[PDB]
Amino acid sequence: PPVKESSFVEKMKKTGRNIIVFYGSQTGTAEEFANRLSKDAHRYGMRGMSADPEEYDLADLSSLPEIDKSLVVFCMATYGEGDPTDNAQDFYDWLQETDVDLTGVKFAVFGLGNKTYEHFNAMGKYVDQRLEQLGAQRIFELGLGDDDGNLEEDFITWREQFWPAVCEFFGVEATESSIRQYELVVHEDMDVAKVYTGEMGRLKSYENQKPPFDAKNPFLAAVTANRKLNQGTERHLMHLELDISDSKIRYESGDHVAVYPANDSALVNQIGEILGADLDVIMSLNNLDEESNKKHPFPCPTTYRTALTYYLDITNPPRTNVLYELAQYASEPSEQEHLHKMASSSGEGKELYLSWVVEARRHILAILQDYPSLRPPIDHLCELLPRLQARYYSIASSSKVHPNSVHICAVAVEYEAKSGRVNKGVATSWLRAKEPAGRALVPMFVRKSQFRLPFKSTTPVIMVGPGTGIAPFMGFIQERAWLREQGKEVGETLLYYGCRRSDEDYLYREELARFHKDGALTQLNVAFSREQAHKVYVQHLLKRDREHLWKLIHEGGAHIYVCGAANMAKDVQNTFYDIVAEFGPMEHTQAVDYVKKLMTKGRYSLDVWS
Ligand SMILES: Cc1cc2nc3c(=O)[nH]c(=O)nc-3n(C[C@H](O)[C@H](O)[C@H](O)COP(=O)(O)OP(=O)(O)OC[C@H]3O[C@@H](n4cnc5c(N)ncnc54)[C@H](O)[C@@H]3O)c2cc1C
Ligand SMILES: Cc1cc2nc3c(=O)[nH]c(=O)nc-3n(C[C@H](O)[C@H](O)[C@H](O)COP(=O)(O)O)c2cc1C
Ligand SMILES: Nc1ncnc2c1ncn2[C@@H]1O[C@H](CO)[C@@H](O)[C@H]1OP(=O)(O)O
């Protein structure tokens, strides 16, 4: 519970703003859109601002009508089980319990979601419906951006109709030109001590480690083990062990660990080199809006090298607004036109953006090379690029067995992009290079989750996790094996695992063998998808054991667990539908419902990513 800021409406009256855009973001996307809509206001004769709903008290909404033509927009993303982002929790809870009258309040909502999840854009739908219930009036249709297809285009399309509608309603009109959020200040005699070198929180935070640790103050865990898990060479699957000794950090199997990686130093040098810039200049980007709490786009003062290395996203396909602001720096007319046309909501521009940038997975350097006429000043490129995000990983260990260590199970990302070059995953390439024992350190923190073992050690457990999904279950199994070692009475523990071949990527083959032999694993059912002509998937095994699984489900009150990358989860879900439908019996419909009831009742947990 942080100390809230004073009334945002009052802050709006002072700074002469009529529109405010809050963001429910966790990975930074929502925030990105919020900031974009906020600036937009200016091109329509209005002034706006974006804000973190956590730092404010949304009850002040009822005072928004005090401002003429005032308007409020919410860019909210959803997380696991249609839940709000951590930073939208206060607002969510408030909407639930409040009875405040929002008469005269004009609002609009854009939801960031992903059609593959159960509760698609639940947060958005809820905010949009709740505000109308409290008596506020919708000024524009609810937006349903789908990250499965292309969220960016969903935002453009929505946005392209949003502003005209706002103008129409408030009787305003168009006016643009390039505007910078920050101002460059080159520091010359800057004492080193006052220069950020990659820390996230306070100056020298990574060196002077003082608890508690978290996203703002990550703990640098030393890598004590980094081994290759797969036997073959098709891909690289590694096992890392981070030592959290004296971190006073607690965790449970099923939780996630987040890490702050470093971009590929050569990729960084090249961006600098090709821009003809000196990545070693010490500078600061100071907000030209002396009112905003966001003093800088990222920790300052610091160097461009450090910025591009630890604070900036330099590998993900740039969004239309970035390519739009950059077109101004392409001396070649044709290249300026393409970059400029990227933000179209249809036609050749949209197509070009979709295939040549997105489908092509062209990162910022690639575009600079494939458009040699584009040479933006380094300082402006840093204001435009998004913030490098922490990457999450399901802890592959139990604290009951490994309280001072956090395990990670991951497959290094490296692929051939249609863009012509070989793209490398940021966090994984970085993790792969971490050699134990010059102490390989990894800035990280733990995030609690709702993917947990059952409370009663007797409850049956069904773990479905193909490929790397086997990650959280390695901790589950250790812990369960541990419960049997501690004389506790443990119910059946079944693992439904999958890989291509037992001689290629059969993860933890030995360990898993140990547990089965010692009885920790009641069943070790493994589906090798490529050892025969047809695919043998984990769900094929669930179908095979329908009779038994049903007995554990319907009578043993067993808990179902699904992990993996993200199509797979759906298949597994339908298999459970058909299992229940045949053994109930019952229609497909009452089956889907049965399995759905199990999810709400906490007996079917999901942990799928990307
Ligand atoms: C909750 C949660 C738990 C997770 N748990 C784990 C885990 O336990 N183990 C694990 O291995 N991962 C896990 N992840 C995934 C992890 O967070 C990262 O997404 C993954 O490690 C890749 O990150 P990176 O920085 O290495 O690569 P990035 O730089 O993040 O690149 C990732 C992007 O590469 C692109 N890409 C990948 N392959 C291709 C391709 N061949 N063609 C075109 N584009 C492609 C995709 O857009 C993908 O999003 C989890 C994710 C979440 C959210
Ligand atoms: C762990 C996790 C859980 C998610 N759960 C949901 C969900 O329940 N419903 C949904 O529509 N989208 C879900 N998504 C997708 C996000 O809503 C979507 O990627 C959004 O663009 C993220 O925005 P942000 O970067 O601003 O947080 C999830 C993503 C992750 C990583
Ligand atoms: N739809 C699906 N359902 C269950 N497993 C799947 C799946 N699609 C792929 N897999 C398997 O997930 C495992 C880890 O990536 C691999 O064995 C992969 O098999 P495949 O690669 O031969 O299709």
Side-chain angles (χ1 to χ4, degrees), residues 1-174 177-188 190-438 440-610:
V3 185
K4 303 286 189 187
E5 301 286 337
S6 36
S7 164
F8 62 76
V9 169
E10 293 306 299
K11 189 172 303 182
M12 270 166 92
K13 294 178 183 173
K14 289 174 188 176
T15 69
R17 309 201 194 308
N18 57 276
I19 173 176
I20 184 167
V21 180
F22 288 105
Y23 49 86
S25 186
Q26 204 160 290
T27 308
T29 315
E31 190 193 307
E32 203 60 281
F33 290 162
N35 297 310
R36 284 163 68 177
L37 294 184
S38 173
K39 304 171 196 300
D40 286 339
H42 189 72
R43 308 182 303 85
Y44 293 105
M46 290 182 266
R47 194 163 307 299
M49 62 177 267
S50 62
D52 192 320
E54 175 163 32
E55 339 193 86
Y56 292 101
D57 167 30
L58 275 299
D60 272 314
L61 269 178
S62 74
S63 298
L64 193 60
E66 292 173 6
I67 297 180
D68 291 326
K69 311 183 184 310
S70 69
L71 169 67
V72 53
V73 173
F74 292 100
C75 291
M76 321 299 279
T78 301
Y79 280 75
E81 312 165 11
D83 283 303
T85 59
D86 299 300
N87 94 304
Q89 195 57 244
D90 269 34
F91 172 50
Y92 181 74
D93 294 335
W94 180 79
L95 295 178
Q96 298 260 311
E97 164 278 317
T98 192
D99 201 63
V100 70
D101 182 67
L102 296 185
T103 298
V105 167
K106 299 302 176 184
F107 79 89
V109 176
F110 180 73
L112 291 82
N114 189 312
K115 290 201 183 68
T116 91
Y117 296 82
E118 212 68 56
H119 311 74
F120 173 61
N121 271 305
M123 191 52 202
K125 298 176 179 185
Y126 180 72
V127 167
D128 172 80
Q129 184 222 55
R130 191 64 186 128
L131 292 184
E132 185 181 16
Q133 278 186 28
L134 298 169
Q137 190 177 77
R138 184 178 302 98
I139 207 177
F140 191 61
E141 67 184 77
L142 165 75
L144 301 157
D146 183 30
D147 195 39
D148 192 67
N150 190 286
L151 180 57
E152 171 71 353
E153 291 295 319
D154 287 307
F155 178 68
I156 305 179
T157 301
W158 184 80
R159 177 197 181 219
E160 185 183 60
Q161 300 170 303
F162 175 75
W163 287 115
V166 174
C167 287
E168 185 73 296
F169 185 94
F170 292 126
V172 303
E173 34 191 350
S177 59
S178 176
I179 295 188
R180 293 200 50 186
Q181 192 66 68
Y182 304 96
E183 67 165 309
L184 174 63
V185 173
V186 175
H187 305 293
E188 214 61 69
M190 184 65 80
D191 321 71
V192 300
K194 273 180 288 299
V195 175
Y196 279 90
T197 47
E199 316 91 298
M200 293 301 279
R202 294 175 52 175
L203 221 28
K204 309 297 179 183
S205 171
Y206 281 174
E207 184 170 355
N208 304 314
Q209 287 270 298
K210 186 172 168 293
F213 300 103
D214 47 42
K216 286 64 58 191
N217 189 51
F219 173 78
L220 281 59
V223 174
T224 91
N226 182 343
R227 64 203 190 68
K228 175 166 166 71
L229 285 180
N230 63 303
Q231 311 74 43
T233 58
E234 301 190 319
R235 325 133 76 189
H236 191 69
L237 285 104
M238 62 205 172
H239 175 85
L240 282 85
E241 296 179 4
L242 303 176
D243 167 33
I244 58 169
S245 294
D246 322 312
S247 72
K248 288 171 177 61
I249 297 183
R250 290 222 197 76
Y251 84 81
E252 291 304 311
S253 311
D255 278 336
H256 296 114
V257 49
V259 305
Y260 288 110
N263 288 304
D264 174 294
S265 49
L267 189 54
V268 175
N269 304 334
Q270 283 182 303
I271 291 175
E273 190 207 309
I274 201 175
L275 291 182
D278 182 326
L279 302 183
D280 290 308
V281 174
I282 297 177
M283 58 74 240
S284 301
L285 284 178
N286 303 325
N287 203 317
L288 286 162
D289 179 330
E290 307 195 70
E291 308 299 340
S292 172
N293 274 293
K294 193 174 191 177
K295 290 292 167 176
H296 317 283
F298 49 72
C300 290
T302 189
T303 64
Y304 292 122
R305 184 176 306 285
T306 305
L308 293 170
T309 305
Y310 310 91
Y311 309 136
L312 306 175
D313 186 323
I314 62 186
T315 71
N316 287 324
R319 293 164 180 292
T320 66
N321 60 305
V322 170
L323 297 180
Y324 191 83
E325 293 295 317
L326 287 169
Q328 66 179 309
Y329 305 110
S331 66
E332 179 57 41
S334 53
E335 297 182 12
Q336 177 166 174
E337 177 71 334
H338 284 322
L339 285 168
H340 178 82
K341 270 297 165 194
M342 300 288 188
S344 304
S345 57
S346 56
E348 68 124 304
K350 181 177 182 181
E351 283 163 298
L352 179 50
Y353 176 68
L354 289 188
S355 68
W356 196 80
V357 167
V358 186
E359 177 64 20
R361 293 297 298 184
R362 283 194 155 68
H363 36 55
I364 183 51
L365 169 63
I367 292 193
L368 291 165
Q369 304 173 316
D370 301 344
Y371 282 154
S373 83
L374 179 52
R375 297 299 178 245
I378 185 77
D379 81 292
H380 194 178
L381 181 59
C382 293
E383 156 178 330
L384 295 174
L385 301 188
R387 293 296 307 287
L388 182 65
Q389 300 299 307
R391 271 63 170 168
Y392 293 79
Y393 291 94
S394 307
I395 309 185
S397 68
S398 167
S399 64
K400 305 258 161 285
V401 181
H402 299 85
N404 298 308
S405 180
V406 161
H407 292 180
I408 287 183
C409 172
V411 53
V413 177
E414 177 169 356
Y415 58 97
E416 11 154 279
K418 296 192 74 175
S419 79
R421 40 283 268 198
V422 171
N423 282 171
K424 286 209 72 181
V426 180
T428 50
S429 309
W430 180 65
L431 286 176
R432 185 173 184 176
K434 288 298 174 189
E435 52 197 60
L441 292 176
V442 171
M444 53 64 90
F445 64 97
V446 172
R447 183 168 187 296
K448 193 170 291 177
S449 78
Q450 295 184 61
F451 201 75
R452 286 273 195 297
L453 271 169
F455 294 106
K456 287 186 299 168
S457 66
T458 61
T459 306
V461 160
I462 303 174
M463 307 165 281
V464 181
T468 55
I470 184 71
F473 303 134
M474 291 311 305
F476 274 22
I477 299 172
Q478 303 171 310
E479 194 160 307
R480 293 275 274 199
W482 180 80
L483 291 182
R484 274 169 63 278
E485 290 174 2
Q486 297 306 79
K488 304 295 169 186
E489 163 179 52
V490 193
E492 279 177 58
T493 304
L494 299 64
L495 181 64
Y496 280 83
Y497 171 73
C499 61
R500 307 178 176 178
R501 304 189 181 64
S502 58
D503 46 70
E504 169 70 36
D505 44 24
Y506 186 149
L507 313 175
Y508 301 108
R509 191 177 52 194
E510 299 64 56
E511 297 91 321
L512 286 172
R514 166 83 301 182
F515 291 126
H516 191 188
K517 177 180 178 297
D518 298 311
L521 265 171
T522 306
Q523 278 188 43
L524 174 53
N525 305 314
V526 183
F528 300 115
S529 64
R530 307 184 187 188
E531 284 190 0
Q532 62 288 298
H534 48 292
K535 303 294 188 179
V536 179
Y537 292 151
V538 289
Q539 55 268 42
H540 291 149
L541 303 181
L542 298 171
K543 172 64 172 192
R544 177 196 64 190
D545 308 335
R546 53 193 174 305
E547 202 301 298
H548 185 57
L549 290 179
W550 168 253
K551 167 178 192 171
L552 288 167
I553 288 177
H554 186 77
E555 299 174 357
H559 277 208
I560 295 182
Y561 294 103
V562 182
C563 182
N567 192 165
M568 180 283 302
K570 288 302 145 300
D571 295 325
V572 170
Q573 196 156 303
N574 298 311
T575 286
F576 280 124
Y577 291 156
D578 305 338
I579 285 192
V580 167
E582 176 196 351
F583 291 60
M586 60 186 93
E587 308 320 295
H588 173 67
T589 292
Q590 293 98 71
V592 169
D593 279 291
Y594 183 101
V595 183
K596 251 58 176 296
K597 184 185 178 66
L598 282 163
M599 303 183 143
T600 56
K601 297 304 185 168
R603 294 180 53 213
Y604 190 126
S605 312
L606 284 168
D607 189 50
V608 295
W609 53 77
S610 62

